[PDB]
């Protein structure tokens, strides 16, 4: 179960974050504990959208999702996901109870700290924090690391994805934003 009400960045710039480009997860902190993950965030016909990519570099399990984000407040969203193939073909339709919340705690032009809480069927899932970068496997800079500290989190507890043999289809993620 999730336990955190993450606070969104003061002065969060939604147009800059939801600009259609890709964000790579470089480090993550699962509160209820080795996938690679990335997302594109953008707008399509005035709707906030995210496309997600998960890849397990050991098992090869790979899945994509597309979501419309509903606004709770600035920087805090609720997203109903549909599982799709890389082309946007629907594999699992949207259903109530399958959603995640998404809070942007810090963002700038190259980096971000987010919180997400996943709800899926009758599964019991926990909070996840992620450090994001515009560049694949980029080392976390001082701004986002300071934001981790300011959120009262210990960055040394995060797990890096940078040393995983991961590959990302950024072209598919960007194209999925319209799906
Ligand atoms: C490296 C960081 C992450 C790891 C290790 C990770 C891990 C996982 C795992 C293991 C599952 C399978 C859950 C299950 O069905 O048992 C999953 C599903 C999911 N995750 Fe993540 N995740 C990460 C980042 C994210 C982020 C940042 C988001 C949202 C922005 C997200 C959203 C989702 C969604 C929506 C599903 C369900 C997709 C579906 O069933 O169609 N994940 N993740």
mmCIF file with all atom_site columns, C-alpha atoms and ligand atoms in Angstrom:
data_model
loop_
_atom_site.group_PDB
_atom_site.id
_atom_site.type_symbol
_atom_site.label_atom_id
_atom_site.label_alt_id
_atom_site.label_comp_id
_atom_site.label_asym_id
_atom_site.label_entity_id
_atom_site.label_seq_id
_atom_site.pdbx_PDB_ins_code
_atom_site.Cartn_x
_atom_site.Cartn_y
_atom_site.Cartn_z
_atom_site.occupancy
_atom_site.B_iso_or_equiv
_atom_site.pdbx_formal_charge
_atom_site.auth_seq_id
_atom_site.auth_comp_id
_atom_site.auth_asym_id
_atom_site.auth_atom_id
_atom_site.pdbx_PDB_model_num
ATOM   1   C  CA  . UNK A 1 1   ? 0.000   0.000   0.000   1.00 0.00 ? 1   UNK A CA  1
ATOM   2   C  CA  . UNK A 1 2   ? 1.113   3.562   -0.627  1.00 0.00 ? 2   UNK A CA  1
ATOM   3   C  CA  . UNK A 1 3   ? 1.915   5.795   2.305   1.00 0.00 ? 3   UNK A CA  1
ATOM   4   C  CA  . UNK A 1 4   ? 3.135   9.148   1.002   1.00 0.00 ? 4   UNK A CA  1
ATOM   5   C  CA  . UNK A 1 5   ? 1.441   12.368  0.043   1.00 0.00 ? 5   UNK A CA  1
ATOM   6   C  CA  . UNK A 1 6   ? 4.230   13.773  -2.114  1.00 0.00 ? 6   UNK A CA  1
ATOM   7   C  CA  . UNK A 1 7   ? 4.359   17.560  -2.350  1.00 0.00 ? 7   UNK A CA  1
ATOM   8   C  CA  . UNK A 1 8   ? 4.634   19.001  -5.856  1.00 0.00 ? 8   UNK A CA  1
ATOM   9   C  CA  . UNK A 1 9   ? 7.363   21.437  -6.836  1.00 0.00 ? 9   UNK A CA  1
ATOM   10  C  CA  . UNK A 1 10  ? 6.526   25.034  -5.990  1.00 0.00 ? 10  UNK A CA  1
ATOM   11  C  CA  . UNK A 1 11  ? 6.194   26.832  -9.310  1.00 0.00 ? 11  UNK A CA  1
ATOM   12  C  CA  . UNK A 1 12  ? 6.145   23.590  -11.321 1.00 0.00 ? 12  UNK A CA  1
ATOM   13  C  CA  . UNK A 1 13  ? 6.307   24.390  -15.043 1.00 0.00 ? 13  UNK A CA  1
ATOM   14  C  CA  . UNK A 1 14  ? 3.852   22.011  -16.669 1.00 0.00 ? 14  UNK A CA  1
ATOM   15  C  CA  . UNK A 1 15  ? 4.452   23.072  -20.271 1.00 0.00 ? 15  UNK A CA  1
ATOM   16  C  CA  . UNK A 1 16  ? 8.197   22.464  -19.859 1.00 0.00 ? 16  UNK A CA  1
ATOM   17  C  CA  . UNK A 1 17  ? 7.734   19.024  -18.287 1.00 0.00 ? 17  UNK A CA  1
ATOM   18  C  CA  . UNK A 1 18  ? 4.917   17.898  -20.624 1.00 0.00 ? 18  UNK A CA  1
ATOM   19  C  CA  . UNK A 1 19  ? 6.774   18.989  -23.745 1.00 0.00 ? 19  UNK A CA  1
ATOM   20  C  CA  . UNK A 1 20  ? 6.692   15.710  -25.679 1.00 0.00 ? 20  UNK A CA  1
ATOM   21  C  CA  . UNK A 1 21  ? 10.272  14.680  -24.922 1.00 0.00 ? 21  UNK A CA  1
ATOM   22  C  CA  . UNK A 1 22  ? 11.540  11.569  -23.096 1.00 0.00 ? 22  UNK A CA  1
ATOM   23  C  CA  . UNK A 1 23  ? 12.616  11.172  -19.465 1.00 0.00 ? 23  UNK A CA  1
ATOM   24  C  CA  . UNK A 1 24  ? 14.832  8.246   -18.381 1.00 0.00 ? 24  UNK A CA  1
ATOM   25  C  CA  . UNK A 1 25  ? 14.699  6.784   -14.882 1.00 0.00 ? 25  UNK A CA  1
ATOM   26  C  CA  . UNK A 1 26  ? 18.282  6.772   -13.582 1.00 0.00 ? 26  UNK A CA  1
ATOM   27  C  CA  . UNK A 1 27  ? 17.700  5.971   -9.898  1.00 0.00 ? 27  UNK A CA  1
ATOM   28  C  CA  . UNK A 1 28  ? 14.704  4.793   -7.903  1.00 0.00 ? 28  UNK A CA  1
ATOM   29  C  CA  . UNK A 1 29  ? 13.568  4.204   -4.326  1.00 0.00 ? 29  UNK A CA  1
ATOM   30  C  CA  . UNK A 1 30  ? 10.853  1.605   -3.802  1.00 0.00 ? 30  UNK A CA  1
ATOM   31  C  CA  . UNK A 1 31  ? 9.312   1.899   -0.348  1.00 0.00 ? 31  UNK A CA  1
ATOM   32  C  CA  . UNK A 1 32  ? 7.968   -1.652  -0.577  1.00 0.00 ? 32  UNK A CA  1
ATOM   33  C  CA  . UNK A 1 33  ? 10.809  -3.703  -2.130  1.00 0.00 ? 33  UNK A CA  1
ATOM   34  C  CA  . UNK A 1 34  ? 15.507  -4.383  -11.251 1.00 0.00 ? 34  UNK A CA  1
ATOM   35  C  CA  . UNK A 1 35  ? 13.664  -2.896  -14.254 1.00 0.00 ? 35  UNK A CA  1
ATOM   36  C  CA  . UNK A 1 36  ? 14.819  -0.108  -16.558 1.00 0.00 ? 36  UNK A CA  1
ATOM   37  C  CA  . UNK A 1 37  ? 12.128  2.459   -17.217 1.00 0.00 ? 37  UNK A CA  1
ATOM   38  C  CA  . UNK A 1 38  ? 11.508  5.598   -19.226 1.00 0.00 ? 38  UNK A CA  1
ATOM   39  C  CA  . UNK A 1 39  ? 8.535   7.768   -20.127 1.00 0.00 ? 39  UNK A CA  1
ATOM   40  C  CA  . UNK A 1 40  ? 7.483   10.453  -22.551 1.00 0.00 ? 40  UNK A CA  1
ATOM   41  C  CA  . UNK A 1 41  ? 5.282   13.233  -21.191 1.00 0.00 ? 41  UNK A CA  1
ATOM   42  C  CA  . UNK A 1 42  ? 3.435   15.619  -23.471 1.00 0.00 ? 42  UNK A CA  1
ATOM   43  C  CA  . UNK A 1 43  ? 0.160   17.100  -24.572 1.00 0.00 ? 43  UNK A CA  1
ATOM   44  C  CA  . UNK A 1 44  ? -2.079  15.839  -27.347 1.00 0.00 ? 44  UNK A CA  1
ATOM   45  C  CA  . UNK A 1 45  ? -5.197  17.789  -28.296 1.00 0.00 ? 45  UNK A CA  1
ATOM   46  C  CA  . UNK A 1 46  ? -5.066  19.658  -24.991 1.00 0.00 ? 46  UNK A CA  1
ATOM   47  C  CA  . UNK A 1 47  ? -4.910  16.491  -22.903 1.00 0.00 ? 47  UNK A CA  1
ATOM   48  C  CA  . UNK A 1 48  ? -1.897  15.673  -20.679 1.00 0.00 ? 48  UNK A CA  1
ATOM   49  C  CA  . UNK A 1 49  ? -0.454  12.326  -21.776 1.00 0.00 ? 49  UNK A CA  1
ATOM   50  C  CA  . UNK A 1 50  ? 2.294   9.945   -20.691 1.00 0.00 ? 50  UNK A CA  1
ATOM   51  C  CA  . UNK A 1 51  ? 3.743   6.955   -22.482 1.00 0.00 ? 51  UNK A CA  1
ATOM   52  C  CA  . UNK A 1 52  ? 5.686   4.460   -20.368 1.00 0.00 ? 52  UNK A CA  1
ATOM   53  C  CA  . UNK A 1 53  ? 8.327   1.839   -21.088 1.00 0.00 ? 53  UNK A CA  1
ATOM   54  C  CA  . UNK A 1 54  ? 9.431   -0.922  -18.705 1.00 0.00 ? 54  UNK A CA  1
ATOM   55  C  CA  . UNK A 1 55  ? 12.225  -3.388  -19.548 1.00 0.00 ? 55  UNK A CA  1
ATOM   56  C  CA  . UNK A 1 56  ? 13.664  -6.131  -17.343 1.00 0.00 ? 56  UNK A CA  1
ATOM   57  C  CA  . UNK A 1 57  ? 17.236  -6.663  -18.586 1.00 0.00 ? 57  UNK A CA  1
ATOM   58  C  CA  . UNK A 1 58  ? 17.322  -10.185 -17.109 1.00 0.00 ? 58  UNK A CA  1
ATOM   59  C  CA  . UNK A 1 59  ? 13.942  -11.743 -17.936 1.00 0.00 ? 59  UNK A CA  1
ATOM   60  C  CA  . UNK A 1 60  ? 13.390  -9.615  -21.040 1.00 0.00 ? 60  UNK A CA  1
ATOM   61  C  CA  . UNK A 1 61  ? 9.881   -8.746  -19.846 1.00 0.00 ? 61  UNK A CA  1
ATOM   62  C  CA  . UNK A 1 62  ? 8.950   -5.609  -21.777 1.00 0.00 ? 62  UNK A CA  1
ATOM   63  C  CA  . UNK A 1 63  ? 5.796   -3.531  -21.743 1.00 0.00 ? 63  UNK A CA  1
ATOM   64  C  CA  . UNK A 1 64  ? 4.491   -0.173  -22.868 1.00 0.00 ? 64  UNK A CA  1
ATOM   65  C  CA  . UNK A 1 65  ? 1.610   1.894   -21.549 1.00 0.00 ? 65  UNK A CA  1
ATOM   66  C  CA  . UNK A 1 66  ? -0.227  5.054   -22.551 1.00 0.00 ? 66  UNK A CA  1
ATOM   67  C  CA  . UNK A 1 67  ? -2.233  7.250   -20.156 1.00 0.00 ? 67  UNK A CA  1
ATOM   68  C  CA  . UNK A 1 68  ? -4.323  10.380  -20.064 1.00 0.00 ? 68  UNK A CA  1
ATOM   69  C  CA  . UNK A 1 69  ? -3.444  12.350  -16.952 1.00 0.00 ? 69  UNK A CA  1
ATOM   70  C  CA  . UNK A 1 70  ? -6.192  13.934  -14.911 1.00 0.00 ? 70  UNK A CA  1
ATOM   71  C  CA  . UNK A 1 71  ? -5.304  16.969  -12.800 1.00 0.00 ? 71  UNK A CA  1
ATOM   72  C  CA  . UNK A 1 72  ? -5.565  16.896  -9.024  1.00 0.00 ? 72  UNK A CA  1
ATOM   73  C  CA  . UNK A 1 73  ? -3.468  20.036  -8.520  1.00 0.00 ? 73  UNK A CA  1
ATOM   74  C  CA  . UNK A 1 74  ? -0.429  21.620  -10.149 1.00 0.00 ? 74  UNK A CA  1
ATOM   75  C  CA  . UNK A 1 75  ? 2.162   18.870  -10.496 1.00 0.00 ? 75  UNK A CA  1
ATOM   76  C  CA  . UNK A 1 76  ? -0.118  16.101  -9.140  1.00 0.00 ? 76  UNK A CA  1
ATOM   77  C  CA  . UNK A 1 77  ? -1.956  13.751  -11.510 1.00 0.00 ? 77  UNK A CA  1
ATOM   78  C  CA  . UNK A 1 78  ? -4.043  10.589  -11.653 1.00 0.00 ? 78  UNK A CA  1
ATOM   79  C  CA  . UNK A 1 79  ? -3.444  8.381   -14.692 1.00 0.00 ? 79  UNK A CA  1
ATOM   80  C  CA  . UNK A 1 80  ? -5.538  5.509   -16.072 1.00 0.00 ? 80  UNK A CA  1
ATOM   81  C  CA  . UNK A 1 81  ? -3.152  3.312   -18.044 1.00 0.00 ? 81  UNK A CA  1
ATOM   82  C  CA  . UNK A 1 82  ? -3.729  1.100   -21.029 1.00 0.00 ? 82  UNK A CA  1
ATOM   83  C  CA  . UNK A 1 83  ? -1.156  -1.488  -21.944 1.00 0.00 ? 83  UNK A CA  1
ATOM   84  C  CA  . UNK A 1 84  ? -0.119  -1.201  -25.586 1.00 0.00 ? 84  UNK A CA  1
ATOM   85  C  CA  . UNK A 1 85  ? 2.468   -2.646  -27.923 1.00 0.00 ? 85  UNK A CA  1
ATOM   86  C  CA  . UNK A 1 86  ? 5.255   -0.326  -29.111 1.00 0.00 ? 86  UNK A CA  1
ATOM   87  C  CA  . UNK A 1 87  ? 3.025   0.824   -31.960 1.00 0.00 ? 87  UNK A CA  1
ATOM   88  C  CA  . UNK A 1 88  ? 0.133   1.873   -29.732 1.00 0.00 ? 88  UNK A CA  1
ATOM   89  C  CA  . UNK A 1 89  ? -2.045  -1.180  -30.408 1.00 0.00 ? 89  UNK A CA  1
ATOM   90  C  CA  . UNK A 1 90  ? -4.157  -1.876  -27.311 1.00 0.00 ? 90  UNK A CA  1
ATOM   91  C  CA  . UNK A 1 91  ? -3.367  -5.030  -25.346 1.00 0.00 ? 91  UNK A CA  1
ATOM   92  C  CA  . UNK A 1 92  ? -5.197  -4.234  -22.103 1.00 0.00 ? 92  UNK A CA  1
ATOM   93  C  CA  . UNK A 1 93  ? -7.942  -1.607  -22.038 1.00 0.00 ? 93  UNK A CA  1
ATOM   94  C  CA  . UNK A 1 94  ? -8.349  1.123   -19.434 1.00 0.00 ? 94  UNK A CA  1
ATOM   95  C  CA  . UNK A 1 95  ? -10.219 -0.080  -16.371 1.00 0.00 ? 95  UNK A CA  1
ATOM   96  C  CA  . UNK A 1 96  ? -11.175 1.531   -13.060 1.00 0.00 ? 96  UNK A CA  1
ATOM   97  C  CA  . UNK A 1 97  ? -8.740  0.482   -10.357 1.00 0.00 ? 97  UNK A CA  1
ATOM   98  C  CA  . UNK A 1 98  ? -5.873  0.370   -12.831 1.00 0.00 ? 98  UNK A CA  1
ATOM   99  C  CA  . UNK A 1 99  ? -4.250  3.753   -12.340 1.00 0.00 ? 99  UNK A CA  1
ATOM   100 C  CA  . UNK A 1 100 ? -1.195  5.463   -10.937 1.00 0.00 ? 100 UNK A CA  1
ATOM   101 C  CA  . UNK A 1 101 ? -0.768  8.782   -9.254  1.00 0.00 ? 101 UNK A CA  1
ATOM   102 C  CA  . UNK A 1 102 ? 2.152   10.907  -10.358 1.00 0.00 ? 102 UNK A CA  1
ATOM   103 C  CA  . UNK A 1 103 ? 3.672   13.877  -8.492  1.00 0.00 ? 103 UNK A CA  1
ATOM   104 C  CA  . UNK A 1 104 ? 6.509   16.031  -9.802  1.00 0.00 ? 104 UNK A CA  1
ATOM   105 C  CA  . UNK A 1 105 ? 8.470   17.045  -6.684  1.00 0.00 ? 105 UNK A CA  1
ATOM   106 C  CA  . UNK A 1 106 ? 11.263  18.796  -8.577  1.00 0.00 ? 106 UNK A CA  1
ATOM   107 C  CA  . UNK A 1 107 ? 11.983  19.485  -12.252 1.00 0.00 ? 107 UNK A CA  1
ATOM   108 C  CA  . UNK A 1 108 ? 14.307  21.579  -14.354 1.00 0.00 ? 108 UNK A CA  1
ATOM   109 C  CA  . UNK A 1 109 ? 15.445  21.470  -17.963 1.00 0.00 ? 109 UNK A CA  1
ATOM   110 C  CA  . UNK A 1 110 ? 17.420  18.240  -17.598 1.00 0.00 ? 110 UNK A CA  1
ATOM   111 C  CA  . UNK A 1 111 ? 16.305  16.475  -14.420 1.00 0.00 ? 111 UNK A CA  1
ATOM   112 C  CA  . UNK A 1 112 ? 13.357  15.645  -12.177 1.00 0.00 ? 112 UNK A CA  1
ATOM   113 C  CA  . UNK A 1 113 ? 12.316  13.916  -8.975  1.00 0.00 ? 113 UNK A CA  1
ATOM   114 C  CA  . UNK A 1 114 ? 8.934   12.209  -9.060  1.00 0.00 ? 114 UNK A CA  1
ATOM   115 C  CA  . UNK A 1 115 ? 6.732   10.132  -6.792  1.00 0.00 ? 115 UNK A CA  1
ATOM   116 C  CA  . UNK A 1 116 ? 4.334   7.524   -8.126  1.00 0.00 ? 116 UNK A CA  1
ATOM   117 C  CA  . UNK A 1 117 ? 1.808   5.203   -6.505  1.00 0.00 ? 117 UNK A CA  1
ATOM   118 C  CA  . UNK A 1 118 ? 0.577   2.285   -8.630  1.00 0.00 ? 118 UNK A CA  1
ATOM   119 C  CA  . UNK A 1 119 ? -2.836  0.639   -8.265  1.00 0.00 ? 119 UNK A CA  1
ATOM   120 C  CA  . UNK A 1 120 ? -3.393  -2.455  -10.379 1.00 0.00 ? 120 UNK A CA  1
ATOM   121 C  CA  . UNK A 1 121 ? -6.209  -4.920  -9.844  1.00 0.00 ? 121 UNK A CA  1
ATOM   122 C  CA  . UNK A 1 122 ? -6.068  -6.631  -6.468  1.00 0.00 ? 122 UNK A CA  1
ATOM   123 C  CA  . UNK A 1 123 ? -2.316  -6.156  -6.147  1.00 0.00 ? 123 UNK A CA  1
ATOM   124 C  CA  . UNK A 1 124 ? -0.853  -4.471  -3.071  1.00 0.00 ? 124 UNK A CA  1
ATOM   125 C  CA  . UNK A 1 125 ? 1.752   -1.975  -4.270  1.00 0.00 ? 125 UNK A CA  1
ATOM   126 C  CA  . UNK A 1 126 ? 3.878   0.699   -2.588  1.00 0.00 ? 126 UNK A CA  1
ATOM   127 C  CA  . UNK A 1 127 ? 5.369   4.143   -3.158  1.00 0.00 ? 127 UNK A CA  1
ATOM   128 C  CA  . UNK A 1 128 ? 8.118   4.662   -5.677  1.00 0.00 ? 128 UNK A CA  1
ATOM   129 C  CA  . UNK A 1 129 ? 10.377  7.690   -6.032  1.00 0.00 ? 129 UNK A CA  1
ATOM   130 C  CA  . UNK A 1 130 ? 12.386  8.158   -9.218  1.00 0.00 ? 130 UNK A CA  1
ATOM   131 C  CA  . UNK A 1 131 ? 15.154  10.435  -10.336 1.00 0.00 ? 131 UNK A CA  1
ATOM   132 C  CA  . UNK A 1 132 ? 14.737  11.258  -14.037 1.00 0.00 ? 132 UNK A CA  1
ATOM   133 C  CA  . UNK A 1 133 ? 17.106  12.710  -16.608 1.00 0.00 ? 133 UNK A CA  1
ATOM   134 C  CA  . UNK A 1 134 ? 16.705  13.885  -20.208 1.00 0.00 ? 134 UNK A CA  1
ATOM   135 C  CA  . UNK A 1 135 ? 19.857  11.909  -20.955 1.00 0.00 ? 135 UNK A CA  1
ATOM   136 C  CA  . UNK A 1 136 ? 20.042  8.138   -20.705 1.00 0.00 ? 136 UNK A CA  1
ATOM   137 C  CA  . UNK A 1 137 ? 22.073  6.924   -17.726 1.00 0.00 ? 137 UNK A CA  1
ATOM   138 C  CA  . UNK A 1 138 ? 23.210  10.475  -16.805 1.00 0.00 ? 138 UNK A CA  1
ATOM   139 C  CA  . UNK A 1 139 ? 24.723  10.838  -13.339 1.00 0.00 ? 139 UNK A CA  1
ATOM   140 C  CA  . UNK A 1 140 ? 22.459  12.758  -10.985 1.00 0.00 ? 140 UNK A CA  1
ATOM   141 C  CA  . UNK A 1 141 ? 23.440  16.426  -10.715 1.00 0.00 ? 141 UNK A CA  1
ATOM   142 C  CA  . UNK A 1 142 ? 23.545  18.645  -7.665  1.00 0.00 ? 142 UNK A CA  1
ATOM   143 C  CA  . UNK A 1 143 ? 20.112  20.205  -8.172  1.00 0.00 ? 143 UNK A CA  1
ATOM   144 C  CA  . UNK A 1 144 ? 18.127  16.972  -8.185  1.00 0.00 ? 144 UNK A CA  1
ATOM   145 C  CA  . UNK A 1 145 ? 20.279  15.443  -5.441  1.00 0.00 ? 145 UNK A CA  1
ATOM   146 C  CA  . UNK A 1 146 ? 19.600  18.496  -3.292  1.00 0.00 ? 146 UNK A CA  1
ATOM   147 C  CA  . UNK A 1 147 ? 15.868  18.098  -4.019  1.00 0.00 ? 147 UNK A CA  1
ATOM   148 C  CA  . UNK A 1 148 ? 16.079  14.487  -2.831  1.00 0.00 ? 148 UNK A CA  1
ATOM   149 C  CA  . UNK A 1 149 ? 17.605  15.737  0.425   1.00 0.00 ? 149 UNK A CA  1
ATOM   150 C  CA  . UNK A 1 150 ? 15.040  18.537  0.761   1.00 0.00 ? 150 UNK A CA  1
ATOM   151 C  CA  . UNK A 1 151 ? 12.284  15.920  0.464   1.00 0.00 ? 151 UNK A CA  1
ATOM   152 C  CA  . UNK A 1 152 ? 13.882  14.279  3.514   1.00 0.00 ? 152 UNK A CA  1
ATOM   153 C  CA  . UNK A 1 153 ? 15.072  11.288  1.488   1.00 0.00 ? 153 UNK A CA  1
ATOM   154 C  CA  . UNK A 1 154 ? 18.511  9.690   1.520   1.00 0.00 ? 154 UNK A CA  1
ATOM   155 C  CA  . UNK A 1 155 ? 19.912  9.429   -1.994  1.00 0.00 ? 155 UNK A CA  1
ATOM   156 C  CA  . UNK A 1 156 ? 22.296  6.596   -1.072  1.00 0.00 ? 156 UNK A CA  1
ATOM   157 C  CA  . UNK A 1 157 ? 19.236  4.379   -0.540  1.00 0.00 ? 157 UNK A CA  1
ATOM   158 C  CA  . UNK A 1 158 ? 18.222  4.729   -4.209  1.00 0.00 ? 158 UNK A CA  1
ATOM   159 C  CA  . UNK A 1 159 ? 19.001  1.954   -6.709  1.00 0.00 ? 159 UNK A CA  1
ATOM   160 C  CA  . UNK A 1 160 ? 20.764  2.937   -9.946  1.00 0.00 ? 160 UNK A CA  1
ATOM   161 C  CA  . UNK A 1 161 ? 19.570  1.655   -13.316 1.00 0.00 ? 161 UNK A CA  1
ATOM   162 C  CA  . UNK A 1 162 ? 22.607  3.083   -15.071 1.00 0.00 ? 162 UNK A CA  1
ATOM   163 C  CA  . UNK A 1 163 ? 24.715  -0.077  -14.852 1.00 0.00 ? 163 UNK A CA  1
ATOM   164 C  CA  . UNK A 1 164 ? 21.976  -2.267  -16.292 1.00 0.00 ? 164 UNK A CA  1
ATOM   165 C  CA  . UNK A 1 165 ? 22.348  -3.250  -19.931 1.00 0.00 ? 165 UNK A CA  1
ATOM   166 C  CA  . UNK A 1 166 ? 19.310  -1.271  -20.912 1.00 0.00 ? 166 UNK A CA  1
ATOM   167 C  CA  . UNK A 1 167 ? 18.173  -0.020  -24.269 1.00 0.00 ? 167 UNK A CA  1
ATOM   168 C  CA  . UNK A 1 168 ? 15.277  2.352   -24.929 1.00 0.00 ? 168 UNK A CA  1
ATOM   169 C  CA  . UNK A 1 169 ? 13.032  2.950   -27.947 1.00 0.00 ? 169 UNK A CA  1
ATOM   170 C  CA  . UNK A 1 170 ? 12.687  6.683   -27.521 1.00 0.00 ? 170 UNK A CA  1
ATOM   171 C  CA  . UNK A 1 171 ? 11.070  7.041   -30.951 1.00 0.00 ? 171 UNK A CA  1
ATOM   172 C  CA  . UNK A 1 172 ? 8.236   4.722   -29.960 1.00 0.00 ? 172 UNK A CA  1
ATOM   173 C  CA  . UNK A 1 173 ? 7.713   6.553   -26.672 1.00 0.00 ? 173 UNK A CA  1
ATOM   174 C  CA  . UNK A 1 174 ? 7.397   9.897   -28.409 1.00 0.00 ? 174 UNK A CA  1
ATOM   175 C  CA  . UNK A 1 175 ? 4.997   8.509   -31.025 1.00 0.00 ? 175 UNK A CA  1
ATOM   176 C  CA  . UNK A 1 176 ? 2.844   6.842   -28.371 1.00 0.00 ? 176 UNK A CA  1
ATOM   177 C  CA  . UNK A 1 177 ? 1.820   10.209  -26.962 1.00 0.00 ? 177 UNK A CA  1
ATOM   178 C  CA  . UNK A 1 178 ? -1.057  10.416  -29.446 1.00 0.00 ? 178 UNK A CA  1
ATOM   179 C  CA  . UNK A 1 179 ? -2.370  6.901   -28.769 1.00 0.00 ? 179 UNK A CA  1
HETATM 180 C  C1  . LIG B 2 .   ? 12.977  1.916   -12.360 1.00 0.00 ? 1   LIG B C1  1
HETATM 181 C  C2  . LIG B 2 .   ? 11.785  2.297   -11.885 1.00 0.00 ? 1   LIG B C2  1
HETATM 182 C  C3  . LIG B 2 .   ? 10.586  1.336   -11.961 1.00 0.00 ? 1   LIG B C3  1
HETATM 183 C  C4  . LIG B 2 .   ? 10.564  0.031   -11.687 1.00 0.00 ? 1   LIG B C4  1
HETATM 184 C  C5  . LIG B 2 .   ? 11.745  -0.816  -11.167 1.00 0.00 ? 1   LIG B C5  1
HETATM 185 C  C6  . LIG B 2 .   ? 9.217   -0.442  -11.954 1.00 0.00 ? 1   LIG B C6  1
HETATM 186 C  C7  . LIG B 2 .   ? 8.748   -1.725  -11.790 1.00 0.00 ? 1   LIG B C7  1
HETATM 187 C  C8  . LIG B 2 .   ? 7.517   -2.194  -12.201 1.00 0.00 ? 1   LIG B C8  1
HETATM 188 C  C9  . LIG B 2 .   ? 7.053   -3.564  -12.109 1.00 0.00 ? 1   LIG B C9  1
HETATM 189 C  C10 . LIG B 2 .   ? 7.854   -4.753  -11.535 1.00 0.00 ? 1   LIG B C10 1
HETATM 190 C  C11 . LIG B 2 .   ? 5.820   -3.620  -12.608 1.00 0.00 ? 1   LIG B C11 1
HETATM 191 C  C12 . LIG B 2 .   ? 4.918   -4.872  -12.710 1.00 0.00 ? 1   LIG B C12 1
HETATM 192 C  C13 . LIG B 2 .   ? 3.837   -4.778  -11.634 1.00 0.00 ? 1   LIG B C13 1
HETATM 193 C  C14 . LIG B 2 .   ? 3.011   -6.036  -11.624 1.00 0.00 ? 1   LIG B C14 1
HETATM 194 O  O1  . LIG B 2 .   ? 2.071   -6.139  -12.449 1.00 0.00 ? 1   LIG B O1  1
HETATM 195 O  O2  . LIG B 2 .   ? 3.292   -6.933  -10.787 1.00 0.00 ? 1   LIG B O2  1
HETATM 196 C  C15 . LIG B 2 .   ? 5.454   -2.289  -13.021 1.00 0.00 ? 1   LIG B C15 1
HETATM 197 C  C16 . LIG B 2 .   ? 4.264   -1.938  -13.591 1.00 0.00 ? 1   LIG B C16 1
HETATM 198 C  C17 . LIG B 2 .   ? 3.857   -0.652  -13.820 1.00 0.00 ? 1   LIG B C17 1
HETATM 199 N  N1  . LIG B 2 .   ? 4.574   0.512   -13.556 1.00 0.00 ? 1   LIG B N1  1
HETATM 200 FE FE1 . LIG B 2 .   ? 6.510   0.592   -12.978 1.00 0.00 ? 1   LIG B FE1 1
HETATM 201 N  N2  . LIG B 2 .   ? 8.466   0.632   -12.411 1.00 0.00 ? 1   LIG B N2  1
HETATM 202 C  C18 . LIG B 2 .   ? 9.281   1.739   -12.426 1.00 0.00 ? 1   LIG B C18 1
HETATM 203 C  C19 . LIG B 2 .   ? 8.921   3.017   -12.804 1.00 0.00 ? 1   LIG B C19 1
HETATM 204 C  C20 . LIG B 2 .   ? 7.640   3.434   -13.092 1.00 0.00 ? 1   LIG B C20 1
HETATM 205 C  C21 . LIG B 2 .   ? 7.212   4.802   -13.311 1.00 0.00 ? 1   LIG B C21 1
HETATM 206 C  C22 . LIG B 2 .   ? 8.147   6.035   -13.204 1.00 0.00 ? 1   LIG B C22 1
HETATM 207 C  C23 . LIG B 2 .   ? 5.890   4.784   -13.555 1.00 0.00 ? 1   LIG B C23 1
HETATM 208 C  C24 . LIG B 2 .   ? 4.921   5.954   -13.862 1.00 0.00 ? 1   LIG B C24 1
HETATM 209 C  C25 . LIG B 2 .   ? 5.333   7.115   -14.366 1.00 0.00 ? 1   LIG B C25 1
HETATM 210 C  C26 . LIG B 2 .   ? 5.464   3.403   -13.539 1.00 0.00 ? 1   LIG B C26 1
HETATM 211 C  C27 . LIG B 2 .   ? 4.186   2.945   -13.780 1.00 0.00 ? 1   LIG B C27 1
HETATM 212 C  C28 . LIG B 2 .   ? 3.815   1.631   -13.905 1.00 0.00 ? 1   LIG B C28 1
HETATM 213 C  C29 . LIG B 2 .   ? 2.545   1.199   -14.434 1.00 0.00 ? 1   LIG B C29 1
HETATM 214 C  C30 . LIG B 2 .   ? 1.386   2.058   -14.960 1.00 0.00 ? 1   LIG B C30 1
HETATM 215 C  C31 . LIG B 2 .   ? 2.574   -0.313  -14.374 1.00 0.00 ? 1   LIG B C31 1
HETATM 216 C  C32 . LIG B 2 .   ? 1.468   -1.280  -14.833 1.00 0.00 ? 1   LIG B C32 1
HETATM 217 C  C33 . LIG B 2 .   ? 1.492   -1.334  -16.361 1.00 0.00 ? 1   LIG B C33 1
HETATM 218 C  C34 . LIG B 2 .   ? 0.519   -2.355  -16.895 1.00 0.00 ? 1   LIG B C34 1
HETATM 219 O  O3  . LIG B 2 .   ? 0.227   -3.381  -16.230 1.00 0.00 ? 1   LIG B O3  1
HETATM 220 O  O4  . LIG B 2 .   ? 0.008   -2.117  -18.003 1.00 0.00 ? 1   LIG B O4  1
HETATM 221 N  N3  . LIG B 2 .   ? 6.550   2.600   -13.255 1.00 0.00 ? 1   LIG B N3  1
HETATM 222 N  N4  . LIG B 2 .   ? 6.510   -1.431  -12.762 1.00 0.00 ? 1   LIG B N4  1
#
